């Protein structure tokens, strides 16, 4: 009875439009002379918010996008549940999140269609959103979902977040090939540059060098030839071994 | 259980020392999309190529070619009316709603 | 008494799967890196990060090179890093350098 | 915890009798005919005067409200029987959602004139339907119906014979116990509990997760392909250390050239001769290469 | 590339996005658990992902290398190194508008800072706790008033 | 040190003169109490609760002593205090120098091969942004900071504009709270 006169409801959408439904400018200069004369709080309040105001106004990008019905995805691989041996497997759960959703848009979607006291839909809907969010992060809002053992679960969010900040990531040193680590002695017989040399050391290590060398004195075949002979460990080795040295 | 084993993945692992050349010649589809798109779907040197094709747009795409086969194939789901010719006699229905005709036709 | 030329590598973070059969393959520190800095051998480090770190490629790749002993496959790109991006996007994150 | 806000929220609903519907359906349903014969009207047009349309389509509004309306005045039940089967499967709600369905379904499924707490009926659909539901979105990789079927059956068994055995059975003791090969049960459980996420960190601190400490058997050697093509093309070279045809002859002899073995007539077909003629020269030039220097030249490729 | 300004920054439109994803899917699903082989709409249209196997149109059909750059009339997929999976990208699609957390979830999340509105509430919108004025007459409620 | 870096406040806070003129000390109940005749003179900057522990200072022409004429940066008592003031009253010029010495100085306590720069080097640091007191018309929330060098840089933008009456100021900036100041997002992102 009346209705004809407007639109009143909820959801982005409506809102969304409210994005649409908007001018900077208006708001802009608005807050402009706002602060220009009135002041404080309010001003400060505005003022500030006038910030972001410009934030857009400025660049040619719309808050519009802030709404959501298209969405991307993790490519495969990324969320892998590769077989844990012993007939076992493990992946990016979360995927679940996806799922879940899938179950939903598929679901309350698949509802649609039918139609009913929405509530229902609302219920999910939001429920979705939520669940999504969860995607974003978990109990960040409310009760964080937690796998059995109430194990809460890794959010979007995470990643370069938490210790595993691919941030943090790099800044950490790590183990790598050919780790000359051992005790030591001087060697009176010394000359700068000079230094110890437990041989069977990179002896062991160096190898790949000659490994291409070697059969250059065609005395192995491939390298498995040599190599495998690296297992043989053969007086010859000590030699051009020398060279590479 | 701290003690590294190897889980186990899935999927081959070519030594397919790649080149580029000499390969298999191809061909293309480009089918038209609802919107109009032509997600141009190349193909091997030869083969059948569809009439349509579900678009990377998740939608689908009939030929990029004015070929143009058929659309039909759909079919209805159930109606609660269908559930009526189900568990109900029409002329009963017929009336019942007719009775209604009385009712709101009654005031 | 150990080091490690190579061997196993975290089926995840394929780093030197250290172990019995393995020499572990010593981990490395961050200061250190800073030392570099105090020089800047870049590469070097970088390299590491790439190389013996877990440069799947050059590992393979220059590993070859090596194998073929030649003006080594010059240092490439933080790759993975590449991922990122993706990783970002991921959240409507798209941007870019130019 | 919305639902709470729901639940309550939903409690806004207003329960009712068990006969309003008697009509209502008579209503409503009277609607289904309303559009129905209505639809006839539309088809011929032949529209009855405005009033006919208001009291009709309007009365269609009757059936609408009255139904939904009641449906609502039934969810509290929905709602109810829903509550309990938790601690397993799906979002309490979502769960519901599917309950709502078995509703929905059974909903439009009940001849009231039959005289039944249909709701109770629906309690198929209701129950069942969702029962399926679990039989639906249970696993991230679920299981073929039958399998689980006999499974639930099984693990149920498990309880049976630990609980009752005062201690869990023993495979064999079960396979026979349940009358099969224990291997069977094994694979079952293998189907039971999923093989864990990985996303769980490494059990502890824990500063790694699951994976952290594994490296698949499947493992890039550094010398394969490597050689392999060293091989491989190195071969090809050798593949030229003699004549000609003998290629596709032999390359085809395993499709080696085109990646697909064949038949003496398949190839020689090309040269036109005889499987005879084919494998004759074939195995011969083998002998050629069956020769050793033919070999060691590629032997370490062994 | 070697020659990189800095990294100008922003988001993306569903376009982009949609303009990006190798399609989407729709099946809380993945592979055959048993045969061990993924699905479609369920996680892992390798087709829109890539094999797990180097140049091998999932309809097996091919697996060579001269086979390459190829579209699969059969299993639609192409031909090469899965990995590009990972490297590919897929999207998601809703049944209605939705929101990004922050300026909502944030704190003090903009949205108000973006709109100057009853956050707490507002939310209520997104959490649908009470409608609000998404349009207005002034005309009928004008003149007609 | 440490805080001597992070420049919070000396628990051994020590009063520090201001203008000059003489001084009307007046100790007591440990809490001394004093009042320096500003050379202005007139209104004397006064101090009261001045526990005897941190008893008076000295100054050669030696020992602290009331009545005497007074000094500007003149640290009142023995002990440490708020360089934040020294600036706030004198800018870093010494301060800097202060600091510095205060640090070497420490190494002095250790006697070590030391050179200054390091700090210098620093120095350049915690002083780099001025505050953001009064945009006047630069529309930058008060209190806030800016690369000084900006604002300035900014300012120029002033170009009249109505003489963009932006107000910011000298600014210590605590290594951490420091550091916060930056630009490479992704950095603090790592933070
Ligand atoms: Zn295929």
Q: If residue D102 lies in a helix (H) or strand (E), which one and from where to where?
A: helix D92-108
Helices (H) and strands (E) in chain E, counts: 6, 2
What sign for the dihedral angle of Cα E100, E105, E106, E109? positive
Ligand 1 centre distance from Cα of residue B47 (Å) = 13
Q: Do C19 and B4 touch (CB under 8 A)?
A: yes
From ligand 1's centre to the CA of B30, what distance in Å?
20
- Going by beta carbons, is chain C in contact with chain D, meaning 3 or more pairs sit under 8 Å apart? yes
Any CB–CB contact under 8 A between A233 and chain D? no
Ligand 1 centroid to Cα of residue B54, in Å, is 17
Phi, psi for residue A159 in degrees, rounded to 5: 75, -115
Q: How far is CA F71 from the centre of its chain?
A: 16
- CB count within 10 Å of CB D159 equals 11
| Residue B79 and residue D31 in contact, taking contact as beta carbons nearer than 8 Å | no
Is the Cβ–Cβ distance between A93 and D199 less than 8 Å? yes
Contacts of E20 (CB under 8 A, 6+ apart): A72, C89, E89, E91
Distance E75 CA to ligand 1 centre (A): 4
Containing D294, the helix (H) or strand (E) segment is helix D293-296
- Residues from A contacting F (CB-CB < 8 Å) are 35, 44, 47-48, 160, 165, 167-168, 171
Q: Could you tell me if E127 lies within 8 Å of chain D, comparing CB atoms?
A: yes
- The secondary structure of chain B, three-state, reads CCCCECCCCCCCCCCCCCCCCCCCCEEECCCEECCCCCCCCEEECCCCCCCCCECCCCCEEECCCCCCCCCCCCCCCCCCCHHHHHHCCHHHHHHHHHHHHHHHCCC
CB contact under 8 A, C98 and E5: yes
A8, A52, A102 member nearest E133 (Cβ): A8
Residues of D with CB under 8 A from a CB of A: 1-2, 6, 10, 68, 71-72, 91, 93-94, 97, 100, 104, 137, 140, 190, 194-200, 207, 210-211, 214, 216-217, 223, 227, 230, 299-301
Helices D123-137 and D92-108 meet at what angle, rounded to 10?
Answer: 140
Instruction: Identify the closest residue of chain B to C17 by CA–CA distance.
Output: B4
Collapsing DSSP to helix, strand or coil, F42 comes out as: coil
CA gap D235, D241 in Å, rounded: 9
CA distance E32 to E43: 11
Buried b (16+ CB within 10 A) or exposed e, A119-141: bbbbbbbbbbbbbbbbbbbbeeb
Pick the residue from chain D with its C-alpha nearest to B81.
D32
Please check whether residue F185 touches A, CB under 8 A. no
Are C93 and E12 spatial neighbours (Cβ–Cβ below 8 Å)? yes
- Phi-psi category of residue F168: left, alpha or beta, with phi > 0 → left and psi -120 to 50 → alpha: beta
Q: Is C74 on the interface with E (CB under 8 A)?
A: no
Q: Select from F121, F79, F73 the least CA-distant residue to F93.
A: F73
| Token output for D8 | 């309550």
- Name residue, tokens 């093509």: D229
| Three-state secondary structure call for residue E78 | coil
- The CA distance from D70 to the nearest CA of chain A, in Å, is 11
Query: Which residues make beta-bridge pairs with B5?
Result: D214
What is the distance in angstroms between the Cα of C40 and the nearest Cα belonging to chain D? 31
CA dist E34 and D187 (Å) reads 11
| DSSP one-letter string for E101-114 | SHHHHSTT-TTHHH
Query: How many A from CA of E61 to the centre of ligand 1?
Result: 5
B28 Cα: distance to centroid of ligand 1 (angstroms): 17
The pairing of beta strand F21-23 with beta strand F67-70: antiparallel
Report CA(E60)–ligand 1 centroid distance (Å): 4
Q: How far is D259 from chain C (nearest CA, A)?
A: 26
Q: How far is A198 from chain E (nearest CA, A)?
A: 41
CB A153 within 8 A of CB D199: yes
Query: What's the gap between Cα F138 and its chain centre?
Result: 26
Long-range Cβ pairs for the range D228-231 (8 Å, 24+): D228/B15, D228/B17, D229/B15, D229/B17, D230/A222, D231/D298, D231/D301
Which of D23, D26, D27, D32 is best to mutate for the B interface (most B CBs within 10 A)? D32
CA–centroid distance for E72 within its chain: 25
CB atoms within 10 A of CB F153: 11
Tokens 């061997």 locate to C7
Q: Is E64 on the interface with D (CB under 8 A)?
A: yes
Distance (Å, whole) CA A241 – CA A218: 15
Buried (b) or exposed (e) across D178-216, using 16+ Cβ within 10 A?
A: beeebeebeebeebbeebbbbbbbeeeeeebbbbbbbbe
A52 Cβ under 8 Å from any chain E Cβ? yes
> D291: which 2 tokens?
């020769």
CB-CB under 8 Å, E36 with B12: no
Question: Alpha-carbon distance E88 to A34, whole Å?
Answer: 50
Q: DSSP of D233-247, one letter per residue?
A: HHHHHHTTSS-STHH
Whether the CB-CB separation of A159 and A166 falls below 8 Å is answered with yes
CB-CB under 8 Å, C9 with D215: yes
| Nearest of B89, B39, B91, B44 to residue B61 by alpha carbon | B39
- Mutation target for D interface from C10, C19, C24: give the one with most D CBs within 10 A: C10
Give every CB contact of residue D149 below 8 A, 6+ residues apart in sequence: none
B73–chain D Cβ distance below 8 A for any pair: no
Q: How far apart are CA D262 and CA D282, in angstroms?
A: 13
Chain B contact for E83 (CB, 8 A cutoff): no
Q: Do A212 and C3 touch (CB under 8 A)?
A: no
Closest CA to A82 of D197, D141, C87: D197
Q: Is A71 on the interface with E (CB under 8 A)?
A: yes
- Burial pattern D166-175, b for ≥16 Cβ within 10 A else e, equals eeebeeeebb
Give residue ranges of C with CB < 8 Å to any B CB: 8, 11, 17, 19
Given a contact cutoff of 8 angstroms between Cβ atoms, the answer to whether D24 and D66 are in contact is yes
| Residue B33: strand pairing partners | B61
Pairwise CB contact (< 8 Å): E71 & B12: no
Q: Which of F91, F71, F85 is nearest to F17 (CA)?
A: F71
How many Cα atoms are found within 13 Å in the side-chain-facing hemisphere of F121?
A: 6
Distance of CA E44 to the CA centre of its chain: 15
Residue of A7, A61, A102 with shortest CB distance to E27? A102
Chain A residue with minimum CA distance to E31: A81
First CA to last CA distance, chain C: 49
- Partner-chain contact C15 A175, CB within 8 Å: yes
Q: What is the number of alpha carbons within 13 Å of residue B39 lying toward its C-beta?
A: 20
* Dist CA E14 CA E21 (whole Å): 10
| A215 and A223 Cβ atoms separated by less than 8 Å | yes
- Contact in structure between F83 and F7 (CB atoms under 8 Å): yes
Query: What is the rounded CA–CA span in Å between residue C82 and residue A99?
Result: 27
Name residues with Cβ closer than 5 Å to ligand 1, which is an ion. Answer: E 57-59, 61, 72, 74-75
Contact F189 A160 (CB under 8 A): yes
Distance of alpha carbon A154 from alpha carbon A234, whole angstroms? 53
Where does chain C have alpha helices with state H? 30-39, 45-54, 56-68, 85-89
Q: D197 and A82 in contact by Cβ < 8 A?
A: no
Inter-chain residue contact C26 with A176, CB threshold 8 Å: yes
Exposure string of B3-24, with b = 16+ CB inside 10 Å and e = fewer, is ebbbbbebbbbbbbeeeeeebb
CB D247: neighbour CB atoms within 10 A?
16
> CB count, 10 Å around CB of D163?
10
CA of B24 to the centre of ligand 1 (A): 15
Way the structure was solved: cryo-EM
**CB within 8 Å: B87 and D111:** yes
Q: Which chain B residues touch E57 with a CB distance below 8 Å?
A: none
């Amino acid at each position: 009875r009346y209705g004809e006169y407007f639109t009143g409801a909820m959801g982005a959408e409506s809102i969304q439009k409210l994005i649409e439904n908007f001018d900077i400018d208006a708001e802009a200069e608005s807050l402009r002379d706002v602060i220009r004369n009135g002041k404080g709080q309010k001003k400060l309040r505005a003022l500030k918010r006038l910030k972001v105001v410009a934030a857009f106004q400025q660049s040619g990008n719309s808050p519009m996008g802030m709404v959501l019905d298209a969405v991307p995805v993790i490519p495969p691989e990324l969320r892998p549940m590769v077989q844990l041996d012993g007939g076992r497997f493990a992946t990016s759960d979360l995927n679940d999140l996806y799922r879940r959703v899938i179950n939903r848009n598929n679901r309350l979607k698949r509802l649609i269609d039918l139609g009913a006291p929405e509530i229902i839909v609302n219920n999910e809907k939001r429920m979705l959103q939520e669940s999504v969010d969860a995607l974003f992060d978990n109990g960040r809002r409310g009760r964080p979902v937690t796998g059995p053992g109430n194990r809460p679960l890794k959010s979007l969010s995470d990643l370069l977040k938490g210790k595993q900040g691919r941030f943090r990531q790099n800044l950490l040193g790590k183990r790598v090939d050919y780790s000359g680590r051992s005790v030591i002695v001087v060697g009176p017989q010394l000359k700068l540059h000079q230094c110890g040399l437990p041989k069977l050391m990179a002896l062991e290590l160096f190898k790949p060098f000659v490994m291409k060398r070697l059969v250059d004195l065609n005395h192995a075949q491939n390298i498995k030839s040599a190599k495998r002979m690296v297992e043989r460990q053969r007086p010859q080795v000590w030699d051009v071994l020398e060279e590479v040295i | 259980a701290d003690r590294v084993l190897r889980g186990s993945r899935l999927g081959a692992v070519s030594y397919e020392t790649d080149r580029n050349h000499d390969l298999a010649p191809r061909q293309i589809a480009r089918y038209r999309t609802d919107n109009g798109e032509e997600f141009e779907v190349p193909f091997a040197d030869d083969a059948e190529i569809p009439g349509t094709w579900l678009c990377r747009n998740g939608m689908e795409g009939t030929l990029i070619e004015g070929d143009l086969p058929e659309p039909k194939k759909v079919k209805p789901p159930r109606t609660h009316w269908d559930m009526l010719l189900e568990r109900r006699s029409i002329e009963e229905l017929e009336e019942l709603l007719k009775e209604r005709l009385e009712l709101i036709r009654s005031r | 008494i150990h080091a490690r030329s190579t061997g196993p590598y975290s089926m995840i973070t394929q780093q030197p799967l250290g172990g019995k059969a393995q020499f572990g393959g010593q981990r490395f520190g961050e200061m250190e890196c800073w030392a570099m800095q105090a020089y800047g051998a870049a590469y070097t480090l970088q390299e590491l990060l790439t190389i013996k770190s877990d440069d799947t490629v050059g590992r393979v790749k220059v590993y070859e090179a090596i194998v073929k002993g030649e003006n080594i496959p010059e240092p490439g790109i933080p790759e993975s890093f590449k991922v990122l991006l993706k990783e970002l996007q991921s959240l409507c994150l798209n941007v870019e350098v130019l | 915890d919305s639902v709470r806000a729901y639940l309550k929220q939903i409690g806004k609903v207003a329960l009712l009798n068990a006969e309003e519907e008697v009509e209502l359906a008579k209503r409503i349903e009277a609607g289904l005919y309303a559009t129905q014969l209505m639809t006839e009207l539309s088809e011929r047009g032949e529209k009855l005067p405005a009033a006919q349309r208001r009291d009709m389509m309007w009365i269609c509004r009757d059936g609408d409200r009255a139904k939904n309306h009641l449906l609502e005045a039934n969810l509290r039940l929905v709602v109810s029987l829903a509550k309990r089967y938790t601690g397993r499967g799906m979002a309490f709600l979502d769960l519901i959602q599917e309950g709502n369905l078995g509703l929905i379904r059974a909903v439009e499924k009940f001849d009231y004139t039959k005289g039944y707490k249909f709701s109770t009926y629906a309690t198929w659909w209701i129950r069942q339907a969702i029962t399926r539901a679990m039989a639906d979105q249970a696993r991230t990789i679920r299981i073929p119906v039958h399998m689980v079927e006999v499974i639930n059956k099984l693990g149920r068994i498990q309880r049976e014979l630990l609980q009752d055995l005062g201690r869990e059975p023993t495979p064999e003791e079960l396979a026979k116990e349940m009358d099969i090969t224990p291997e069977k049960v094994l694979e079952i459980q293998q189907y039971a509990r999923e093989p864990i996420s990985l996303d769980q960190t490494i059990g502890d601190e824990g500063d790694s997760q699951l994976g952290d400490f594994i490296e698949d058997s499947e493992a890039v050697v550094a010398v394969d392909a490597v050689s392999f093509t060293l091989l491989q093309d190195q071969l090809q070279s050798v593949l030229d250390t003699l004549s000609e045809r003998e290629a596709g002859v032999v390359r085809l002899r395993f499709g080696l050239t085109d990646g697909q073995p064949r038949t003496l007539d398949e190839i020689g077909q090309v040269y036109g001769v005889t499987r005879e003629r084919i494998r004759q020269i074939e195995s011969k030039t083998m002998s050629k290469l069956r020769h050793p220097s033919r070999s060691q030249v590629l032997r370490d490729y062994l | 590339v070697n020659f990189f300004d800095e990294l100008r920054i922003g988001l993306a439109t569903a376009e982009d996005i949609r303009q990006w994803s190798y399609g989407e899917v729709k099946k809380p699903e993945t592979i055959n658990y048993r045969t061990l082989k993924p699905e479609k709409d369920g996680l892992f249209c390798e087709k829109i992902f890539g094999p797990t196997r180097d140049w091998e149109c999932y309809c097996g059909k091919y697996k060579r290398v001269r086979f390459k750059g190829i579209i699969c009339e059969r299993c639609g997929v192409e031909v090469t190194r899965a990995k590009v999976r990972r490297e590919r990208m897929g999207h998601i699609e809703l049944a209605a508008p939705v929101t990004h957390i922050w300026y909502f979830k944030g704190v003090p999340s903009r949205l108000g800072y973006l709109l100057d509105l009853a956050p707490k509430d507002l939310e209520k919108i997104i959490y649908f706790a009470a409608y609000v004025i998404t349009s207005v007459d002034e005309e009928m409620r004008h003149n007609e008033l | 040190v440490q805080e001597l870096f992070e420049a919070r406040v000396p628990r051994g806070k020590a009063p520090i003169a201001d203008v000059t003129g003489r001084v009307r000390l007046e100790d007591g109940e440990r809490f001394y109490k004093i009042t320096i005749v500003p050379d202005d003179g007139g209104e004397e900057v006064v101090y009261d609760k001045i526990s005897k522990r941190q008893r008076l200072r000295v100054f050669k022409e030696r020992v602290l002593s009331d009545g005497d004429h007074v000094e500007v940066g003149q640290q009142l008592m023995e002990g440490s205090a708020d360089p934040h003031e020294v600036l706030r009253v004198q800018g870093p010029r010494e301060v800097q120098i202060h600091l510095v010495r205060e640090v070497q100085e420490v190494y002095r306590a250790q006697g070590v091969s030391i050179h200054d720069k390091h700090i210098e080097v620093i120095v350049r640091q915690m002083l780099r942004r001025v505050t953001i007191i009064d945009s006047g018309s630069t529309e930058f929330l008060p209190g806030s900071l800016i690369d000084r060098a900006e604002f300035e840089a900014e300012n120029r933008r002033v170009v009249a504009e109505g003489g963009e009456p932006a107000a910011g100021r000298p600014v210590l900036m605590g290594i951490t709270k420091a550091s916060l100041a930056t630009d490479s997002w992704l950095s603090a992102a790592s933070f």
